Design a protein around this motif. Structure first.
Motif, mmCIF file in Angstrom:
data_model
loop_
_atom_site.group_PDB
_atom_site.id
_atom_site.type_symbol
_atom_site.label_atom_id
_atom_site.label_comp_id
_atom_site.label_asym_id
_atom_site.label_seq_id
_atom_site.Cartn_x
_atom_site.Cartn_y
_atom_site.Cartn_z
ATOM 1 N N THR A 1 0.843 -1.219 0.000
ATOM 2 C CA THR A 1 0.000 0.000 0.000
ATOM 3 C C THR A 1 0.865 1.250 0.000
ATOM 4 N N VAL A 2 1.956 1.245 0.753
ATOM 5 C CA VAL A 2 2.885 2.414 0.643
ATOM 6 C C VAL A 2 3.425 2.501 -0.791
ATOM 7 N N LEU A 3 3.859 1.367 -1.363
ATOM 8 C CA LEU A 3 4.446 1.381 -2.713
ATOM 9 C C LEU A 3 3.436 1.968 -3.682
ATOM 10 N N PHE A 4 2.184 1.536 -3.634
ATOM 11 C CA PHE A 4 1.222 2.066 -4.594
ATOM 12 C C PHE A 4 0.757 3.489 -4.327
ATOM 13 N N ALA A 5 0.638 3.862 -3.050
ATOM 14 C CA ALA A 5 0.341 5.257 -2.715
ATOM 15 C C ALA A 5 1.454 6.118 -3.230
ATOM 16 N N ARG A 6 2.693 5.687 -3.012
ATOM 17 C CA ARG A 6 3.804 6.491 -3.582
ATOM 18 C C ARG A 6 3.746 6.527 -5.119
ATOM 19 N N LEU A 7 3.413 5.358 -5.723
ATOM 20 C CA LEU A 7 3.382 5.266 -7.204
ATOM 21 C C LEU A 7 2.402 6.297 -7.733
ATOM 22 N N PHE A 8 1.194 6.379 -7.124
ATOM 23 C CA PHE A 8 0.213 7.276 -7.724
ATOM 24 C C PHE A 8 0.575 8.716 -7.400
ATOM 25 N N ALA A 9 1.200 8.953 -6.248
ATOM 26 C CA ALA A 9 1.710 10.316 -5.942
ATOM 27 C C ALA A 9 2.697 10.738 -7.014
ATOM 28 N N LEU A 10 3.529 9.835 -7.524
ATOM 29 C CA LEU A 10 4.551 10.182 -8.524
ATOM 30 C C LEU A 10 3.977 10.221 -9.919
ATOM 31 N N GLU A 11 3.059 9.290 -10.213
ATOM 32 C CA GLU A 11 2.610 9.157 -11.629
ATOM 33 C C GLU A 11 1.112 8.853 -11.585
ATOM 34 N N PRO A 12 0.264 9.858 -11.327
ATOM 35 C CA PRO A 12 -1.135 9.563 -11.230
ATOM 36 C C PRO A 12 -1.732 9.103 -12.555
ATOM 37 N N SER A 13 -1.036 9.260 -13.675
ATOM 38 C CA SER A 13 -1.620 8.793 -14.938
ATOM 39 C C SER A 13 -1.681 7.283 -15.009
ATOM 40 N N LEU A 14 -1.060 6.620 -14.026
ATOM 41 C CA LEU A 14 -1.251 5.157 -13.925
ATOM 42 C C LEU A 14 -2.616 4.767 -13.377
ATOM 43 N N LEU A 15 -3.275 5.691 -12.640
ATOM 44 C CA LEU A 15 -4.540 5.342 -11.995
ATOM 45 C C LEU A 15 -5.590 4.709 -12.900
ATOM 46 N N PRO A 16 -5.767 5.212 -14.143
ATOM 47 C CA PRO A 16 -6.879 4.675 -14.925
ATOM 48 C C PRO A 16 -6.558 3.273 -15.472
ATOM 49 N N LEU A 17 -5.311 2.849 -15.364
ATOM 50 C CA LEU A 17 -4.959 1.543 -15.970
ATOM 51 C C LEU A 17 -5.574 0.403 -15.186
ATOM 52 N N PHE A 18 -6.021 0.664 -13.958
ATOM 53 C CA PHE A 18 -6.618 -0.355 -13.104
ATOM 54 C C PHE A 18 -8.071 -0.359 -13.289
ATOM 55 N N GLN A 19 -8.510 -1.138 -14.279
ATOM 56 C CA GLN A 19 -9.869 -1.135 -14.724
ATOM 57 C C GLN A 19 -10.461 -2.439 -14.239
ATOM 58 N N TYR A 20 -11.390 -2.300 -13.301
ATOM 59 C CA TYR A 20 -12.073 -3.398 -12.650
ATOM 60 C C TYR A 20 -13.531 -2.969 -12.777
ATOM 61 N N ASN A 21 -14.376 -3.881 -13.262
ATOM 62 C CA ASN A 21 -15.795 -3.573 -13.554
ATOM 63 C C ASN A 21 -15.898 -2.389 -14.518
ATOM 64 N N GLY A 22 -15.009 -2.365 -15.511
ATOM 65 C CA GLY A 22 -14.969 -1.317 -16.539
ATOM 66 C C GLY A 22 -14.863 0.135 -16.071
ATOM 67 N N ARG A 23 -14.661 0.341 -14.767
ATOM 68 C CA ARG A 23 -14.680 1.691 -14.157
ATOM 69 C C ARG A 23 -13.254 2.129 -13.796
#
Ligand code: HEM
Length: 148
Positions: A23-45
């Motif tokens: 959870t720290v790794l991913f919180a840091r990941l999105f803090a650094l590169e929030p454009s990764l957020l939409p790549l996690f598509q679960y239930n098409g959302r």
């Protein structure tokens, strides 16, 4: 290898709480590169904000999957060639989900951040270098999935 032990030893601490640490790794990941957020598509959302990802069981399951691939690398820290074909295909899968190979550099920094934060003074230069090499080797194998 002396590095193999630095990696083994540091990973013991993390592996006690892999979701909290991932959870720290991913919180840091999105803090650094929030454009990764939409790549996690679960239930098409799409997750709107990084804290949304933390409420998603599928995303948290991906955190556990990541931590297990790292665990597989640690288990093979002396011979990564045994993970090559798996990692190539994992590369190919992430290519397919939309992840650019360069984003794996951000992930490496986020992994190093997470290890720094958890290990504090035990995150020695040698320990950092050891992880950097192992992570690089993982990403080298994955990059074969982007066919090069
Ligand atoms: C750029 C960062 C990454 C993003 C955006 C990402 C995204 C995804 C997505 C969308 C999936 C498919 C849905 C799922 O099963 O959750 C997936 C699968 C997976 N990811 Fe990642 N991932 C990233 C980094 C990583 C890393 C660094 C690892 C391990 C080192 C990893 C391990 C996995 C595994 C084990 C799966 C299951 C693949 C399968 O066999 O179907 N991911 N990832």
């Amino acid at each position: 290898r002396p590095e193999s032990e630095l990696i083994r030893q540091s990973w013991r601490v993390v592996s006690r709480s892999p979701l909290e640490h991932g959870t720290v790794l991913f919180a840091r990941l999105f803090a650094l590169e929030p454009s990764l957020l939409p790549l996690f598509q679960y239930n098409g959302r799409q997750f709107s904000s990084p804290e949304d990802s933390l409420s998603s069981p599928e995303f948290l399951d991906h955190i556990r999957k990541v931590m297990l691939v790292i665990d597989a690398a640690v288990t093979n820290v002396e011979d990564l060639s045994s993970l090559e074909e798996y990692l190539t295909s994992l590369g190919r899968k992430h290519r397919a989900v939309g992840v650019r190979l360069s984003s794996f550099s951000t992930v490496g920094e986020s992994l190093l951040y997470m290890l720094e934060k958890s290990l504090g003074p035990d995150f020695t230069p040698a320990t950092r270098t050891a992880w950097s090499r192992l992570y690089g080797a993982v990403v080298q194998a994955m990059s074969r999935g982007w066919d090069g």
